[PDB]
Design a protein around this ligand. Structure first.
Ligand SMILES: CCCCCCCCCCCCO[C@H]1O[C@H](CO)[C@@H](O[C@H]2O[C@H](CO)[C@@H](O)[C@H](O)[C@H]2O)[C@H](O)[C@H]1O
Ligand SMILES: CC1(C)CCC(C)(C)c2cc([C@H](O)C(=O)Nc3ccc(C(=O)O)cc3F)ccc21
Length: 236
């Protein structure tokens, strides 16, 4: 047993929770825009969606800086890691806000969109793949500590190209992986495949993020102006 490891778990858990409200903590509200038929694009929904995406990107940067050692990396390496992982973490985040009964996802201001509205906000032909990923996350029953650590593991990874100090990043990732296995096994000792299944979701996230970046390129053709600047930073 390690006191340092337990403090790391609590610190990452609290950093996730304070930068990403839980479904249960949110006052849900809805919209009647484009709610019943899929269209190419509803620009009112794109505008609201992209605004919320921008806010969540800021929250991910805030979460990252709360991770032990992260601000000890070069500023360039911090930005490199954020740019490489932010879409992955966003995809994880919105898929933890999925309500199977209503077939909806909920954003951090409580906006709750049905599947068609998600499509119409810009997800387009990526919509059903995203909802199926969200679907297959549910059986894991991850809690907010596990989502936070998995997100941290996604972000702090020394494989990203163009890192200055990849070995320093590897060493920062090591206790995160240790903490997630410890925590997961302790919380559900009868389900020992939970930790490896959680790590396998990172590859799935990367696949979904890649499709979302491809979708960003066609969506650009359809909106009257450039995407919001922090979204562009992520997509470069
Ligand atoms: C992946 C793409 C990211 C690559 C790196 C580029 C993004 C770097 C963003 C750092 C932004 C710094 O944030 C700076 O302005 C933000 C908006 O005015 C403020 O953000 C503040 O307001 C937000 C509301 O919009 C809140 O959700 C934040 O919790 C709060 O801290 C910060 O308090 C301030 O420190
Ligand atoms: C429409 C499409 C496919 C192309 C454009 C970009 C790349 C911006 C993108 C980005 C995401 C991403 O998962 C996201 O931003 N999620 C997200 C997560 C949480 C919150 C919140 O808590 O409020 C808001 C969000 F917006 C999903 C779809 C797309």
């Amino acid at each position: 047993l390690s006191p340092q490891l337990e403090e790391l778990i609590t610190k990452v858990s609290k950093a996730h929770q304070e930068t990403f409200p839980s479904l249960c903590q949110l006052g849900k509200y809805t919209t009647n825009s484009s709610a019943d038929h899929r269209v190419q694009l509803d620009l009112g929904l794109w505008d609201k969606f992209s605004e919320l995406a921008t806010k969540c990107i800021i929250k991910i940067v805030e979460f990252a800086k709360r991770l032990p050692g992260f601000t000890g990396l070069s500023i360039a390496d911090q930005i490199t890691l954020l740019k490489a992982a932010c879409l992955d973490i966003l995809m994880l985040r919105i898929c933890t806000r999925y309500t199977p009964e209503q077939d909806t996802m909920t954003f951090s201001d409580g906006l709750t969109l049905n599947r068609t509205q998600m499509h119409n906000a810009g997800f387009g032909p990526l919509t059903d793949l995203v909802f199926a990923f969200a679907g297959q996350l549910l059986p894991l029953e991850m809690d907010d500590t596990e989502t936070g650590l998995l997100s941290a593991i996604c972000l702090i990874c020394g494989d990203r190209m163009d890192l200055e100090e990849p070995e320093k990043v590897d060493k920062l990732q090591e206790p995160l992986l240790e903490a997630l296995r410890l925590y997961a096994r302790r919380r559900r000792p009868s389900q020992p495949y939970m930790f490896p299944r959680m790590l396998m979701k990172i590859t799935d996230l990367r696949g979904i993020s890649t499709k979302g970046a491809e979708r960003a390129i066609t969506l650009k053709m359809e909106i009257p102006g450039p995407m919001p600047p922090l979204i562009r930073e992520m997509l470069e």
